[PDB]
Amino acid sequence: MREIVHIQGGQCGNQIGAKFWEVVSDEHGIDPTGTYHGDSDLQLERINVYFNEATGGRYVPRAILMDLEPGTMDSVRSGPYGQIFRPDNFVFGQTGAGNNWAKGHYTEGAELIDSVLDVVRKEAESCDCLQGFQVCHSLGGGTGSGMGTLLISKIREEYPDRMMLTFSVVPSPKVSDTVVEPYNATLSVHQLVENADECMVLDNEALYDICFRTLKLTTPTFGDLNHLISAVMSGITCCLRFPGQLNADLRKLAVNLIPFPRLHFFMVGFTPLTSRGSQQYRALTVPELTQQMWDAKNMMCAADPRHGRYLTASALFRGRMSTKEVDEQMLNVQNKNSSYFVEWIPNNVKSSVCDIPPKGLKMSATFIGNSTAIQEMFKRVSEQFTAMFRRKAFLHWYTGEGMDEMEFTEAESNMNDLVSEYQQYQD
């Protein structure tokens, strides 16, 4: 009875939120119409965390689909598992940010931030005991990053005790869908270091690398990439919706994985990813899952973990299993390579067992890692920012709306401070 209020932002967030509800409603037994047709009894024990009761046995999600262009939300409603959401939660804008962080945060997001707060206020007051607000967005965007982070700032001043999980898709190193991605990313992380309780860092070429060399997919689409990030989102909350041998809510991951209040940027990974040919041949054993989960290839962030030390890591295992093969395999990976783990924190790896595996799998696992190796990603984004900010290009849209050029300095200042504190734990 600890409810999560999901808020999706931007074209990416609404697309990744639609794919996220495809794996939750299916695993909980919700048909596309909205009713319950689950074949087991363990689902109905915990429906309230992501669904609300309705007349006729309908279950509607606690989802607030937030966007500034109507071209994204009409696609979500028309797709499969699409008309489950409420029509009131479908909050929309007219002008659209157009991949500008400035317009979303200040000018054309000011008349929408009041229209999205009362929807969240109505949803949060309806449920009895919040565990936290979960959001999913990008940082290179303008709608889901600019006005998305304004939503996070105005929800932390309202509820300062509840948690925050930001599944944020950072701009990619190798590819760039938008020219102003370094400008939008650095200003979005400037908000996220203080107000966000946790941050899930995802990168597209990290997803492309996993879909290529691990899944052997000839032509991945965005549906391939969305459902892998969707697997992580369902993997964190697997304890909340289902009983297990060792229970672990979101706040149990908060206390273990966060040493210091600015150490809340994590890198994720879904463990049992195989090609369709290799499904039958590979035996699904727990040390095989441990071998894949700690691999730098399987982890879903473009920052290479071998360049730094894991300050704290957590593994969330799902399925019927014994505790030891979870237990000493986490001990095995601490002793085989002790250089890759930090010294002053003993027993760096946290573990949890859930008794209900996801659909189609006997066993599964999900990884969370608080590595200092993610400083390279933030230093790279800061490298692109200082390249652009020195010549002051692409700024007249930002400073022409009412924000000053001084504000870009503090965005870079704590960006350099975020990697400054990451450096002084690697040494």
């Binding site: 299916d26 939300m73 899944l215 997919l217 991945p220 391939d224 459902h227 659909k359 189609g360 799998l361």
Partner: protein, 88 residues
């Protein structure tokens, strides 16, 4: 009992209930919107079946719309998790 007559229908020319001014969207339902008065679908995305039925043959416009719908469906397919079936 008395010589009782009919009053003449002297009045304004009255329009029926079908006019847009006197239409009652909630008629006899106690402040609930009546059926067959539906909310507008967003942007009126017509399916391609009606466009097929209007024309005699699947023309270039029909084939281009089919290609666009097929591309959208191929992008929406996850290729790792089937609809209603578990991974793989």
């Amino acid at each position: 009992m008395f010589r009782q007559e009919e009053q003449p229908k002297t009045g304004v020319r009255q329009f029926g209930t079908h006019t847009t001014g006197k239409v009652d969207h909630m008629l006899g339902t106690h402040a609930t919107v009546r059926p067959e008065y539906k909310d507008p679908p967003p942007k009126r995305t017509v399916p391609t079946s009606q466009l097929e039925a209007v024309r005699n043959i699947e023309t270039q416009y029909i084939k281009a719309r089919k290609a666009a719908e097929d591309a959208r469906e191929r992008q929406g397919t996850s290729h790792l998790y089937a609809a209603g079936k578990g991974w793989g």
